[PDB]
Amino acid sequence: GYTYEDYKNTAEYLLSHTKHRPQVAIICGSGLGGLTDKLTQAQIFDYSEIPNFPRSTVPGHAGRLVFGFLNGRACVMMQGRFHMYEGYPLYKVTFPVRVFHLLGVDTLVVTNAAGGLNPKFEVGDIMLIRDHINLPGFSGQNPLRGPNDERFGDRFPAMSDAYDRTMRQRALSTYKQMGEQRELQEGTYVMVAGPSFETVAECRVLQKLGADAVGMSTVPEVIVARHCGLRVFGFSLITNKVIMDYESLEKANWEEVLAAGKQAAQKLEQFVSILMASIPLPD
Amino acid sequence: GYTYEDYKNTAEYLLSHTKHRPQVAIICGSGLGGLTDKLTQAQIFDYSEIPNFPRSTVPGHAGRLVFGFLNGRACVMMQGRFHMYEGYPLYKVTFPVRVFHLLGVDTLVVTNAAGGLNPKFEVGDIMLIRDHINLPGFSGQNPLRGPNDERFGDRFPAMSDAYDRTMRQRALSTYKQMGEQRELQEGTYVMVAGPSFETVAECRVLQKLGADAVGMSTVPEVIVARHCGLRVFGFSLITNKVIMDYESLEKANWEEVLAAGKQAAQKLEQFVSILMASIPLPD
Amino acid sequence: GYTYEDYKNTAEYLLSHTKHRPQVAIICGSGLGGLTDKLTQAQIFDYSEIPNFPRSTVPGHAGRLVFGFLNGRACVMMQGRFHMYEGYPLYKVTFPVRVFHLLGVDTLVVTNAAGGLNPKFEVGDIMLIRDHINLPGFSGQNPLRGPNDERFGDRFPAMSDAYDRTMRQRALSTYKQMGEQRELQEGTYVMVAGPSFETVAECRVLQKLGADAVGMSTVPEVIVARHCGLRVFGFSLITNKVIMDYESLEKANWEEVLAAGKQAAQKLEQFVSILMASIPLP
Numbered sequence: 001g002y003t004y005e006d007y008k009n010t011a012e013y014l015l016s017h018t019k020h021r022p023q024v025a026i027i028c029g030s031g032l033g034g035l036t037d038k039l040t041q042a043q044i045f046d047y048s049e050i051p052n053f054p055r056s057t058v059p060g061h062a063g064r065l066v067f068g069f070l071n072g073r074a075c076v077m078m079q080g081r082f083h084m085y086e087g088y089p090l091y092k093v094t095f096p097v098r099v100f101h102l103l104g105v106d107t108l109v110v111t112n113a114a115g116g117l118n119p120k121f122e123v124g125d126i127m128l129i130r131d132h133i134n135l136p137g138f139s140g141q142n143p144l145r146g147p148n149d150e151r152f153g154d155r156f157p158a159m160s161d162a163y164d165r166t167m168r169q170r171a172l173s174t175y176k177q178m179g180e181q182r183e184l185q186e187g188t189y190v191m192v193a194g195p196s197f198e199t200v201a202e203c204r205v206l207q208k209l210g211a212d213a214v215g216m217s218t219v220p221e222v223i224v225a226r227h228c229g230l231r232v233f234g235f236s237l238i239t240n241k242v243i244m245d246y247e248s249l250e251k252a253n254w255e256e257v258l259a260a261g262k263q264a265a266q267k268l269e270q271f272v273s274i275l276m277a278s279i280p281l282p283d
Numbered sequence: 284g285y286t287y288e289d290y291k292n293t294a295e296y297l298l299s300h301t302k303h304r305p306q307v308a309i310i311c312g313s314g315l316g317g318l319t320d321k322l323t324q325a326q327i328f329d330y331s332e333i334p335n336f337p338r339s340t341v342p343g344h345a346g347r348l349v350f351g352f353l354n355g356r357a358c359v360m361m362q363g364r365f366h367m368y369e370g371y372p373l374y375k376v377t378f379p380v381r382v383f384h385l386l387g388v389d390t391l392v393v394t395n396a397a398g399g400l401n402p403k404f405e406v407g408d409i410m411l412i413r414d415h416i417n418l419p420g421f422s423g424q425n426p427l428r429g430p431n432d433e434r435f436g437d438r439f440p441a442m443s444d445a446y447d448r449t450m451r452q453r454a455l456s457t458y459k460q461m462g463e464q465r466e467l468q469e470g471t472y473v474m475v476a477g478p479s480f481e482t483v484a485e486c487r488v489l490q491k492l493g494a495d496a497v498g499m500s501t502v503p504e505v506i507v508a509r510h511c512g513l514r515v516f517g518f519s520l521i522t523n524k525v526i527m528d529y530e531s532l533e534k535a536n537w538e539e540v541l542a543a544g545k546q547a548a549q550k551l552e553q554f555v556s557i558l559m560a561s562i563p564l565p566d
Numbered sequence: 567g568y569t570y571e572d573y574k575n576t577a578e579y580l581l582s583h584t585k586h587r588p589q590v591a592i593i594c595g596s597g598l599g600g601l602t603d604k605l606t607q608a609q610i611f612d613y614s615e616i617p618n619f620p621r622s623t624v625p626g627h628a629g630r631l632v633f634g635f636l637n638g639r640a641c642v643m644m645q646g647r648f649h650m651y652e653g654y655p656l657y658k659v660t661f662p663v664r665v666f667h668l669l670g671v672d673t674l675v676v677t678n679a680a681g682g683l684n685p686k687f688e689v690g691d692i693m694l695i696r697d698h699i700n701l702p703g704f705s706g707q708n709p710l711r712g713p714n715d716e717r718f719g720d721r722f723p724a725m726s727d728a729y730d731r732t733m734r735q736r737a738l739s740t741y742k743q744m745g746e747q748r749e750l751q752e753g754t755y756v757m758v759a760g761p762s763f764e765t766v767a768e769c770r771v772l773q774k775l776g777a778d779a780v781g782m783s784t785v786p787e788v789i790v791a792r793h794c795g796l797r798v799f800g801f802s803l804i805t806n807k808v809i810m811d812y813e814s815l816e817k818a819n820w821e822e823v824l825a826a827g828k829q830a831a832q833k834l835e836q837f838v839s840i841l842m843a844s845i846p847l848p
């Protein structure tokens with residue numbers, strides 16, 4: 001897909017057009033549509049402005065990067081993403097992450113919506129990602145497929161420690177501060193390609209494999225971030241409880257997902273800000 | 284792959300060249316090679332005649348759509364299909380289904396051959412598909428991958444109710460009429476890409492995941508049908524019992540599959556006809 | 567990808583440029599032994615020389631086929647392979663296997679490195695592959711995908727008997743001779759695409775599915791070999807034990823893998839030679 005130069009050009013373009021120098025990249029999933037509003041000294045770039053950036057044909061906008069400070073933390077926020085189910089190859093899906101690395105970002109925060117597989121979870125819960133199961137990865141759909149560039153990382157990176165232990169500990173503490181009724185969940189996120197929702201039998205399979213939440217994103221980004229050495233922290237908003245029996249007349253649907261994203265908007269906004277304080281300083 | 288126009292053209296061609304107006308599409312799998320013979324007022328179209336239709340290089344024929352009445356039921360029958368293992372992309376495999384929708388069909392009946400994973404199953408059994416596990420789908424091989432057309436259906440369709448409850452109830456009753464020794468089985472169908480047959484370890488994996496039968500087709504069609512609102516009903520002829528241990532010297536083989544398809548031909552022909560009576564009338 | 571001609575040309579080129587006529591092809595695992603040194607009457611071909619052969623951009627060399635005798639057994643050895651994770655399509659990954667068949671080879675020995683999923687395995691163990699779980703295969707990534715050529719094999723080949731039971735029984739049988747403290751393991755190999763290593767959750771998934779060892783190669787080759795009638799035998803050097811819990815601070819890494827491949831080099835070299843004696847005659 002892209003050459004090392006391509007990534008470098010894209011980073012140079014951004015670096016030369018802003019004085020912001022982000023430590024943390026945040027990929028906004030459902031419910032963080034409005035997180036930019038909490039940025040101070042915001043500066044926007046549209047994907048159409050940025051060289052080599054792929055573009056969503058999705059009607060509203062191409063999407064944007066927004067630099068700024070979140071609780072005095074120097075960050076870049078990514079709004080609008082690319083998904084495997086939309087037809088994008090994985091090197092396009094994960095293009096931004098390699099760019100962030102070249103911006104000198106050292107921490108990636110990924111968020112998403114997911115269906116709850118774990119019976120304890122409730123719509124509205126936040127689940128810290130402790131680990132993932134990369135089903136597309138097993139079959140070949142891994143973003144690192146192809147020639148490896150030692151300037152980014154190793155030919156065979158490890159994923160057993162992908163989700164930073166310390167940030168999860170600190171996240172667990174600091175969540176008490178918000179004084180929420182439901183606690184912070186923690187669990188395994190499984191990635192499926194989508195875009196259709198799971199059958200009952202499929203949900204049962206995912207449960208047996210050990211997954212607590214299922215979604216259609218995030219994992220490829222995590223793998224690329226880890227490949228180039230970034231610290232990674234992630235979580236899912238449980239937006240619906242996956243159907244697990246044939247009796248129910250309920251069905252997963254996207255409007256439900258958006259509604260859940262709205263209810264949780266503030267909780268999520270609050271939580272990401274707080275979390276900024278927990279992030280270690282550069283080096 | 285195709286544009287909305289393409290589908291529309293193909294449907295218009297067919298609609299303008301026949302007065303038949305099918306309610307039910309039937310995709311014939313093994314053992315239904317001769318089901319066209321029970322059609323009254325038959326009218327054939329070869330795939331070579333039909334605009335935008337993909338074509339099998341398989342030597343005998345391109346294959347054909349045959350309109351007609353089966354037990355006075357207005358239907359179109361599809362003979363010869365396209366498979367993922369043959370190299371076809373999924374939007375080609377499932378092209379006919381979208382066309383059937385545009386013909387005003389509202390019920391899809393899919394049939395196939397499958398290996399028996401459930402120890403209770405016997406060669407010759409018919410298994411009603413209650414649900415499926417779409418393994419290729421997990422990895423990205425989903426026919427709906429790419430831009431969604433809202434003229435067909437939603438961006439994120441649900442599959443939890445894919446196989447019509449009522450049809451299955453009615454099918455279970457009406458099977459008594461044939462007075463068969465072995466009863467109607469019901470279970471989960473798993474799709475694997477093929478074309479090689481499962482190892483023992485793989486068979487055990489598919490059993491653990493909860494599958495009763497394994498095949499190499501059908502699921503992409505079902506997903507597309509449901510996406511555009513069709514009622515779906517399906518079943519598998521158990522043509523062989525998958526090897527489950529290292530002692531056996533038996534091996535799956537395609538001649539065995541064809542033989543089973545032949546033994547069952549009449550039972551199957553009978554069953555599909557009967558079933559026509561059970562189908563609801565056009566809403 | 568390739569036509570039947572292409573395969574034939576490549577075979578004709580090789581046949582016409584050597585008098586060696588191998589019975590056994592051996593694919594030396596990426597991470598494993600430089601066993602060519604034990605070949606007598608060696609004759610090398612570089613991949614660059616051979617028509618239609620794909621080529622590794624990997625800096626050191628394209629890689630080579632080396633004909634010869636190993637314990638008086640007429641064989642061809644393949645050093646350097648192609649992997650799905652490198653971007654190669656499967657028909658390129660398995661191209662050599664089809665060519666071996668056309669050379670008149672009738673037995674394929676495949677070896678590789680693998681991470682240990684079964685708690686009983688120890689770094690250094692050899693695991694005979696009794697069976698495999700082809701995960702990419704389930705999703706479409708099967709090397710036989712596309713039109714079938716009946717000149718090679720059936721449209722729907724069976725894999726339930728892929729790994730020759732006699733060769734395994736003999737291997738385990740004569741292993742006594744390998745006067746090792748530790749014995750010959752036997753198990754299920756699972757293929758995953760790679761190139762990144764498994765998480766803990768994935769490890770547990772693969773364990774539940776019944777796999778004993780996990781790797782990123784071999785299976786496509788085996789599928790192609792069996793499609794054209796070859797006898798297949800295969801084994802894995804357990805080069806590391808896959809991380810199974812969140813507490814550990816160990817991580818899989820490729821240097822560990824190369825180290826283990828080094829410690830085991832002689833044990834492996836010895837074992838393959840011995841095995842030559844066990845192979846049936848044409």
Ligand SMILES: Nc1nc2[nH]cnc2c(=O)[nH]1
Nearest residue numbers: 113114115214215216252
């Ligand atoms: N695959 C999948 N993704 C989701 N994202 C939000 N809910 C769901 C779900 O139920 N399934």
Ligand SMILES: Nc1nc2[nH]cnc2c(=O)[nH]1
Nearest residue numbers: 396397398497498499535
């Ligand atoms: N994968 C698969 N497909 C089939 N079609 C008919 N029998 C079988 C079988 O045993 N396995």
Ligand SMILES: Nc1nc2[nH]cnc2c(=O)[nH]1
Nearest residue numbers: 679680681780781782818
């Ligand atoms: N996937 C995989 N392949 C390997 N080859 C050697 N070790 C490993 C491992 O731990 N995982």
